[PDB]
Amino acid sequence: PKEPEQLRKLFIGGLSFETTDESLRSHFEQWGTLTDCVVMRDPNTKRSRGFGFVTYATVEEVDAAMNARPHKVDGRVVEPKRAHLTVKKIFVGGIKEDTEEHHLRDYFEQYGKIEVIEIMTDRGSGKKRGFAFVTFDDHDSVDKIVIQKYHTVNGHNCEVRKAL
């Protein structure tokens, strides 16, 4: 009944070298229960590697943490990412000739703030080619999208992947 642990983790980059397991935990526990929280360190010197990870009890807690960005942890703005090809644009395929901008917008706007929707048309005829690109203002939207098993838009079962 628990979501897979991999989907509950956040890799936190750009840490202050002074951040510890304890201070990273105290920060990120504001958005959920942490089942794990570790700062990566050198095995010999114990000096921070500048990144670490936190594991929440649920995916909704991961979402809450991501929605609370930017995170300033021990004085430094850090870079959380879900468990990286960091892009803001998706390819959406399988939408056929009847899918319009509003179909894509109404669905994808619940993943993130949309900046561009490009419904692809044939260079020669202008007919729709059956695929589109959606650009968001931030990569987490795409990360949430591509881990779903299924996307249904305008009644079509769509293929969605990271784009460039």
Ligand SMILES: COc1ccc(NC(=O)CN)cc1
């Ligand atoms: C920034 O854009 C969005 C960010 C988060 C959500 N929803 C959730 O996080 C729901 N748990 C939707 C849009």
